[PDB]
């Protein structure tokens, strides 16, 4: 269970737009940990790992 720290606008290619304060569920990461595959109310896709953090 994670929260978004900053807005991120999808750059396509299975990335996912997220908004600061939104909750996400994390499925995993890419090979170097820089991208995170996440689920939000808006769908599923890749977001910057550094743009989210655990919450609770």
């Amino acid at each position: 269970l994670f929260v978004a720290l900053y807005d991120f606008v999808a750059s396509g290619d299975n990335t996912l737009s997220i908004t600061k304060g939104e909750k996400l569920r994390v499925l995993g990461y890419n090979h170097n940990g820089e991208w995170c595959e996440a689920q939000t109310k808006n769908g599923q896709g890749w977001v910057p790992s550094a743009y989210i953090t655990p919450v609770n």
């Binding site: 900053y6 990461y29 820089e34 890749w46 743009y51």
Partner: peptide, 10 residues
């Protein structure tokens, strides 16, 4: 995942 790096945190 994208083959390009993500944006740096602001």
């Amino acid at each position: 995942a994208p083959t390009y790096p993500p944006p740096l945190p602001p």
